[PDB]
């Protein structure tokens, strides 16, 4: 929700000890580009961090 900011004033969300479900997060989105560095794309959705 809300107007997203520009690239030099991005808004942060920190996550520590909470349940995340990207199957209901990214279902509201459509990925145009998906790039990752040092991990696989499937590593986030399964490995506990």
């Amino acid at each position: 929700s809300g107007t997203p900011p520009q690239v030099y004033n991005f808004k942060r969300l920190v996550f520590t000890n909470c349940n995340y479900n990207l199957t209901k997060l990214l279902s509201l989105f459509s990925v145009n580009d998906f790039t990752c560095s040092q991990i696989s794309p499937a590593a986030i959705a399964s490995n506990c961090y």
Partner: protein, 49 residues
Amino acid sequence: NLTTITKPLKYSYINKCSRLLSDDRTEVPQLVNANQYSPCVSIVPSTVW
């Protein structure tokens, strides 16, 4: 002073090669091994437009 070999229009390369799964939600990249070709050359011709 060597004309027997010719010149193409431009150079071109691939910057992304991934696949969709049956869920149409997740992208799996492919890494070509030594002295073979990724399957994604089957969809792009020798000259990228």
